[PDB]
Amino acid sequence: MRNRREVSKLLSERVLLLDGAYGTEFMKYGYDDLPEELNIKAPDVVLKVHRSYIESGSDVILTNTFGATRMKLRKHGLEDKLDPIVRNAVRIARRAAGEKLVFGDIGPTGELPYPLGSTLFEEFYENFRETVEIMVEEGVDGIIFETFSDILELKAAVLAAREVSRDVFLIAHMTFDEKGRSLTGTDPANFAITFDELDIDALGINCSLGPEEILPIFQELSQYTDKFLVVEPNAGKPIVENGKTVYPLKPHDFAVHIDSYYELGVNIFGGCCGTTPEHVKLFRKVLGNRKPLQRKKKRIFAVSSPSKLVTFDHFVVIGERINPAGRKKLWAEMQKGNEEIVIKEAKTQVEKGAEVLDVNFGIESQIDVRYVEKIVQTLPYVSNVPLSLDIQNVDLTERALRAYPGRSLFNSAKVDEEELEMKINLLKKYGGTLIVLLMGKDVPKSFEERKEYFEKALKILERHDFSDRVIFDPGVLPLGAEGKPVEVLKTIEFISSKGFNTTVGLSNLSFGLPDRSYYNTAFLVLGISKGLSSAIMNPLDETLMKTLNATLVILEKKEL
C-alpha cells in the first residue's frame, strides 16, 4: 500500500498508464455474469483480465468492484456478499499487479438523490464508507470514483472516503454526455470548481464518449483545477450494431489522442468500456516515459448547484424570501417540516430573476436538523439555482455544508478572529465561499470604521489562505436607526476598487419605514453605480426588479 504522498510523488515524475475495460472484456471469456459476482464465482477470469492489462504495460489497475456497494449490490440480490466481493477483488488485483498500483474502483449506485430519487446524502455517504473501509483494509494504493453522473452522490462518495482515510490517494470522476453535461446537469467547469477545493488528489473523466469527444470537455476541466488529472475514454462513442453495443475505435486511432491529453496536463491515461488489452499495448508504446506538464488554472469566484454555475461577473440577485423573520406562516410551517412551502418560495423567486437563493431557518433550536438537511439537498434540484446558506449555529452549518449539492455561499461571518476561523475551516473541509460582514466587537458608524474592519478581515483571510473565497458585505443599517447609507456607498466603492465582490442585505435599509420599495430601489441603484456586485433582496418587488434591469441597461452591463 502506497499513500497519497507516495502516489503524488510518482505522478509528479511520470505520466502513468491505467488499464482498459473489465465489464466489456468478461463476455469474451464466456462470462456474462455481473462482473462483481465473478470475484466469487470465477476469480480466475478476473485474474486473467487484470493480467491482460499488466502484461500490456499498465502502471495501475482497477479492482473489479465498480458495482460493489450495498445500494447497487442490493438490486442484484448480492448485498450480503459485499464483504467477500470486495476483499476477493482487492486480493485478486494485488496478485496480478505485484509492485504496480492497485486502485479500489467504485462506481455510482444508479439511485438519484432526493427529490429526483428517494435517497438522502446520509445514505449515499454510509453506502460508500463501507466499501472504502474494506478497500483501505485490504491495502489499495488509491480509491477512484468512476462514471459518476450526479455531484451530490459524488460529494458523498469523496467525503465518505476521506473520513475513512486521510492518507489514501483519492480520484473523483464524472461522466459527461456529448453536450458536456452530467445526468443532473453539471458541466466540467462546475465539476472542477466544486471538487477542486475538496480534499481529493485528482479529478477526471471516464466513459460515455470517445477520446475525440472528451478532449474539449477535458480541456475545460483542466482549466479549473490544479489537481492531478485522469482520463479514460470509451474506445469511440458507443454504437449499436446487430442488437449489441459496439465500441468501434481501433488501437491506433485511439492511441493517436495521447499527445493531445498530455498537452492538457493529463497525469494518468487509460480507457473505459470498449478498451481492450490491444489498445493498452499500443498506449504503452505511444505514451512511453513522460514527465507531466505544469498548468496554472483560471481563478474565478462562482457558486453552483447541480445544473447552474453562477459566476460573479455580472450583478447577482440573491433572493431573500426563504427567511421566517416577520413571516408567521412560514415560521410555523418550517417548524412542522413543511418542504412544499419553501419549495414554492424558491421557484417563484427564481421565476422572477433570483440567480441564488438565501435560506435561513429562524430560531435554529426550534428546527429539525433533518429538515435543514433535506431542504438544503432539495432546493438546488427543484429551483435549479445555488444557495446562500444563512445559518447561525456552527453545528447546523456543518450539516448543511456536508449535504449541499455544489459550491455554496455561506451567509455570514463577522470580523472576529474566532468566528472567522471556525467558519473558514468548515468551508475548507466541505467547499464553499463566504460572506464577510464588516462589523465585530461593535457595529461601524463610518466609512473609516468599515475600512478598518475590511483590513482586519484581509489579514485574517490571508493567514488562512482564504482571500479568494469571500464576498464583502459592508453592513447596511436601517435609515430610521441613523443608518448613514452614504457611508455604506463609500465602502462599496472602496471594496470594488480593491477587486472584491460585494453584497448587501438590502431590505435592512428600509426596516421600519413606509415606502420601503422606493428606499430599497434608490439604494440599489446607487450601490450598483459604486460597483455593488450582488444583493440579498426581494425579487418579487416588481419596481425594484424593473428599475434594476433599467439600471444595468443604462450602465452598459446588459440588454435592450
Residue ranges binding ligand HCS (CB under 6 A)? 21-23, 62, 66, 105, 146-147, 207, 272-273
**Dihedral sign, Cα of residue 107, residue 109, residue 111, residue 112:** negative
Residue 133 burial by Cβ neighbours in a 10 Å radius (0-12, 13-18, 19+): middle
Residue 272 counted as an annotated binding residue: yes
- Residues with Cβ within 8 Å of residue 356, at least 6 apart in sequence: 303, 310, 316, 317, 318, 319, 385, 386, 387, 388, 409, 534
Binding positions for Zn ion, rule: CB under 5 A: 207, 272-273
Residue 407's CB: how many other CB atoms inside 10 A? 26
Residue 22 counted as an annotated binding residue: yes
- Contact partner, 270, from ligand HCS, K ion, Zn ion, none, Cβ < 5-8 Å per class: K ion
* Residue whose CB is less far from a second copy, 307 or 510: 510
247-286 mask for K ion (x: CB under 5 A)?
-----------------------x----------------
* Of 518, 515, 446, 524, residue with least CA distance to 484: 446
**Reduced to 3 states, what is the DSSP secondary structure of residue 320?**
strand
Residue 118 burial by Cβ neighbours in a 10 Å radius (0-12, 13-18, 19+): exposed
Note whether 265 and 273 are within 8 A (CB).
Answer: no
Residue 508 counted as an annotated binding residue: yes
* Residue whose CB is less far from a second copy, 63 or 521: 521
Binding positions for a second copy, rule: CB under 8 A: 479-480, 484-486, 513, 515, 518-519, 521-523, 525-526, 529, 543, 546-547, 549-551, 553-556, 560
Q: What's the closest the beta carbon of residue 53 comes to Zn ion, in angstroms? A: 15
Residue 411 counted as an annotated binding residue: yes
DSSP string spanning 57-95? Answer: T-SEEE-S-TT-SHHHHGGGT-GGGHHHHHHHHHHHHHH
Q: What's the closest the beta carbon of residue 273 comes to Zn ion, in angstroms? A: 4
Distance CA 197, CA 504 (A): 26
Residue 473 counted as an annotated binding residue: yes
- Contact partner, 99, from ligand HCS, K ion, a second copy, none, Cβ < 5-8 Å per class: none
Distance CA 95, CA 50 (A): 9
* Residue whose CB is less far from a second copy, 305 or 521: 521
- Contact partner, 482, from Zn ion, ligand HCS, a second copy, none, Cβ < 5-8 Å per class: none
Rounded to the nearest angstrom, the gap between the alpha carbon of residue 314 and the centroid of all alpha carbons in its chain is: 22
- Contact partner, 550, from ligand HCS, a second copy, K ion, none, Cβ < 5-8 Å per class: a second copy
- Residues with Cβ within 8 Å of residue 72, at least 6 apart in sequence: 107, 108, 109, 110
Among 4, 11, 17, 19, binds K ion (CB under 5 A): 19
Q: What's the closest the beta carbon of residue 118 comes to ligand HCS, in angstroms? A: 24
User: Binding site: what residues are annotated?
Assistant: 22-23, 147, 207, 234, 272-273, 390, 411, 473, 508, 516
- Binding stretches for K ion (CB under 5 A): 18-19, 232, 270
